[PDB]
Design a protein around this ligand. Structure first.
Ligand SMILES: [Mg+2]
Ligand SMILES: [Mg+2]
Length: 450
């Protein structure tokens, strides 16, 4: 078997996981839970071995979700008193335990606001643009990504084998609740953020156990044009996702959801990639500060199962069981408990003990697709600066840039020794076209800038 994978030199276990995730589509959907062994309402103090899901269904989820907030010391097992390095050691320990249980690990990144010192919910500071290549706070993103690379390398089985992780950075960017969202950067600025993240981890740090997930949000009504507006590209994404919460349980909701789920499944099928329901749940959760829409879990599942295309999604993850006010997996006292248990007992939903042959497959990577993109200035950006061009997946002889408004400037770039071909530029709508002469032929790309 030969598969399209973002990291063409990913570990055998990592290519196996991507193979497994595609093959499971339409046969069964893996249930996922965020912080499943680190936050619980029925577990007592957590140590990476107990889960609310296990306690109420008799099995751990098939997908264990985590966050880089652990590294920051803002979420258990991470502690604010700890160094980032000991938080990383705790993080890797919990991933190791999940793997031993038989689950698949996924990691999101609720990244701190580098500019303001605030949280991921602080949308001031112009932080997205500040962390892009050439940005005033770019070094801080680099430091943050180094910690992630460190975590990836610490995530090893007892025998030394790297545990595959589905890394899902910069999620829900079609909305504006996070500082990396749609109101704080053009689609092109977001794309360069995502591309840089992949390239820094894979190419500069040599991370080999990552699959890359991208999930811009939910509620697209099956509109591919809106959904793919911020699509980073085939060379950057392994898993296409969708994040949708509801508390109505209405026919209108389920119809819109099915439309989005078949949309992502079609796109993934066409591209030879995987699609997944990356986040789902009752809005506000199922606790005292949430809702109990009648039979919500089984209604969602029935709507998915009834559709032969919508059901072609590898996993569906719900959110963290923080406290009585805010939790997403029902516990005794919650009206939705029995319905979740019914959802869990459905043969279509897969839990930890039902995950088999995920990591031991023999599969080859398709050769990496050659790419060129202008990292600065990003498409849609407002502009002395440095033009940065990335050429990946091939040997490069030269890179030339033409600025047009009629051509007003021609730049010959030089390789910087690590990532970009660059040149100085001293600049009402410019067109910036990069042309790379490579061993895979001529590649070009055009960014439009104000
Ligand atoms: Mg590598
Ligand atoms: Mg089941």
């Amino acid at each position: 078997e030969t598969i399209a994978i973002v990291d063409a030199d990913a570990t055998a276990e990592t290519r196996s996981l991507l193979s497994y995730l595609d093959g499971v589509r339409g046969e069964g959907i893996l249930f996922g839970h965020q912080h499943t062994t680190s936050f619980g309402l029925t577990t007592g103090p957590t140590d990476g071995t107990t889960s609310d899901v296990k306690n109420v269904t008799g099995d751990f989820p098939a997908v264990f979700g985590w966050d880089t907030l652990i590294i920051e010391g803002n979420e258990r097992p991470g502690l604010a008193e700890n160094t980032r390095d000991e938080n990383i050691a705790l993080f890797a320990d919990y991933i190791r335990k999940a793997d031993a249980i038989g689950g698949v690990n996924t990691v999101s990144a609720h990244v701190e606001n580098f500019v303001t010192g605030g949280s991921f919910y602080d949308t001031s500071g112009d932080t997205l643009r500040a962390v892009l290549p050439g940005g005033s706070h770019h070094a801080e993103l680099v430091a943050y990504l180094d910690d992630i690379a460190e975590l990836a390398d610490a995530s090893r089985r007892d025998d030394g084998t790297l545990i595959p992780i589905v890394f899902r950075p910069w999620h829900e960017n079609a909305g504006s609740w996070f500082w990396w969202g749609a109101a704080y950067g053009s689609p092109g600025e977001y794309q360069e953020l995502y591309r840089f993240t992949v390239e820094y981890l894979r190419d500069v740090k040599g991370v080999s156990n990552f699959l890359y997930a991208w999930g811009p949000g939910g509620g697209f009504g099956g509109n591919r044009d809106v959904y793919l507006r911020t699509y980073p590209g085939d060379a950057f994404v392994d898993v296409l996702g969708l994040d949708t919460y509801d508390s109505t349980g209405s026919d209108a909701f389920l119809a819109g959801l099915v439309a989005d789920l078949r949309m992502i499944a079609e796109i993934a099928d066409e591209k030879g990639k995987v699609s997944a329901f990356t986040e789902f749940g009752v809005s506000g959760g199922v606790g005292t500060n949430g809702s109990s829409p009648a039979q919500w879990f089984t209604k969602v599942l029935a709507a998915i199962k009834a559709d032969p295309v919508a059901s072609r999604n590898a996993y569906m993850e719900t959110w963290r069981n923080a406290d009585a006010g805010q939790h997403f997996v029902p516990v005794p006292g919650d009206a939705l408990l029995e319905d979740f248990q019914a959802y869990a007992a459905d043969p279509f939903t897969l839990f930890a003990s039902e995950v088999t042959g995920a990591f031991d497959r023999t599969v080859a990577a398709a050769p990496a697709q050659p790419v060129v993109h202008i990292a600065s200035p990003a498409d849609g950006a407002r502009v002395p600066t440095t033009v940065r061009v990335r050429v990946g997946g091939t040997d490069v002889q030269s890179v030339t840039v033409e600025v047009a408004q009629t051509v007003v400037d021609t730049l010959d770039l030089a390789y910087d020794g690590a990532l970009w071909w660059t040149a100085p530029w001293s600049p009402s709508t410019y067109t910036v076209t990069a042309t790379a002469t490579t061993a895979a032929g001529t590649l070009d790309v055009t960014n439009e800038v104000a």
